[PDB]
PDB file of C-alpha atoms and ligand atoms in Angstrom:
ATOM      1  CA  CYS J   1       1.873  26.903 155.905  1.00 18.74           C
ATOM      2  CA  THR J   2       4.114  28.812 158.274  1.00 14.89           C
ATOM      3  CA  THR J   3       6.671  30.508 155.996  1.00 14.99           C
ATOM      4  CA  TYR J   4      10.462  30.677 156.479  1.00 16.37           C
ATOM      5  CA  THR J   5      13.063  32.436 154.309  1.00 17.43           C
ATOM      6  CA  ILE J   6      16.248  30.628 153.295  1.00 14.97           C
ATOM      7  CA  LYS J   7      19.488  32.153 154.642  1.00 17.30           C
ATOM      8  CA  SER J   8      23.155  31.511 153.841  1.00 18.00           C
ATOM      9  CA  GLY J   9      24.174  27.949 154.792  1.00 18.47           C
ATOM     10  CA  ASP J  10      20.617  26.723 155.451  1.00 18.41           C
ATOM     11  CA  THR J  11      19.754  23.160 154.457  1.00 17.40           C
ATOM     12  CA  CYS J  12      16.380  21.425 154.323  1.00 16.89           C
ATOM     13  CA  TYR J  13      17.703  18.834 156.796  1.00 15.06           C
ATOM     14  CA  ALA J  14      18.854  21.448 159.346  1.00 16.07           C
ATOM     15  CA  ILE J  15      15.607  23.402 158.976  1.00 14.12           C
ATOM     16  CA  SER J  16      13.591  20.210 159.567  1.00 15.33           C
ATOM     17  CA  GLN J  17      15.775  19.004 162.439  1.00 12.52           C
ATOM     18  CA  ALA J  18      15.658  22.388 164.218  1.00 16.79           C
ATOM     19  CA  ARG J  19      11.842  22.379 164.057  1.00 18.31           C
ATOM     20  CA  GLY J  20      11.504  18.703 165.035  1.00 16.64           C
ATOM     21  CA  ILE J  21       9.866  17.674 161.751  1.00 17.02           C
ATOM     22  CA  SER J  22      10.804  14.930 159.325  1.00 16.84           C
ATOM     23  CA  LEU J  23      12.490  15.991 156.096  1.00 14.89           C
ATOM     24  CA  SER J  24       9.838  13.890 154.266  1.00 13.58           C
ATOM     25  CA  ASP J  25       7.005  15.899 155.835  1.00 12.28           C
ATOM     26  CA  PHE J  26       8.881  19.107 154.967  1.00 12.46           C
ATOM     27  CA  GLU J  27       9.177  17.903 151.373  1.00 13.08           C
ATOM     28  CA  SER J  28       5.447  17.059 151.292  1.00 14.85           C
ATOM     29  CA  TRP J  29       4.689  20.714 152.141  1.00 15.66           C
ATOM     30  CA  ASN J  30       7.113  22.122 149.573  1.00 17.26           C
ATOM     31  CA  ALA J  31       6.048  20.993 146.089  1.00 15.55           C
ATOM     32  CA  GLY J  32       9.185  19.299 144.668  1.00 17.03           C
ATOM     33  CA  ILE J  33      11.621  21.768 146.309  1.00 16.48           C
ATOM     34  CA  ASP J  34      15.220  21.225 145.224  1.00 15.15           C
ATOM     35  CA  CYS J  35      17.085  20.776 148.471  1.00 12.86           C
ATOM     36  CA  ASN J  36      20.514  20.741 146.752  1.00 14.81           C
ATOM     37  CA  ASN J  37      19.886  24.064 144.990  1.00 10.68           C
ATOM     38  CA  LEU J  38      18.273  26.355 147.567  1.00 10.68           C
ATOM     39  CA  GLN J  39      18.493  30.100 146.879  1.00 12.07           C
ATOM     40  CA  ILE J  40      19.121  32.735 149.539  1.00 12.46           C
ATOM     41  CA  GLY J  41      15.701  34.436 149.886  1.00 10.76           C
ATOM     42  CA  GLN J  42      13.707  31.393 148.804  1.00  9.77           C
ATOM     43  CA  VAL J  43      10.511  30.913 150.837  1.00 12.35           C
ATOM     44  CA  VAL J  44       9.572  27.481 152.230  1.00 13.80           C
ATOM     45  CA  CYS J  45       6.796  26.040 154.415  1.00 14.37           C
ATOM     46  CA  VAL J  46       7.937  24.814 157.860  1.00 15.99           C
ATOM     47  CA  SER J  47       4.589  23.658 159.312  1.00 15.20           C
TER      48      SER J  47
HETATM   49 ZN1   ZN Q 101       5.111  12.936 159.747  1.00 17.27          ZN
HETATM   50 ZN1   ZN Q 102      19.154  19.818 142.282  1.00 20.49          ZN
END
């Protein structure tokens, strides 16, 4: 897991798209993450 910290206006889709990964793979690395309720400062895996 490469970590990334959620910033204002971030979405799981935009994070995935910017890194050239599928949103499904991103979800598989992020244990039931709630993509419609992200918190500023939340830490996610991007690899
Ligand atoms: Zn894949
Ligand atoms: Zn939700």
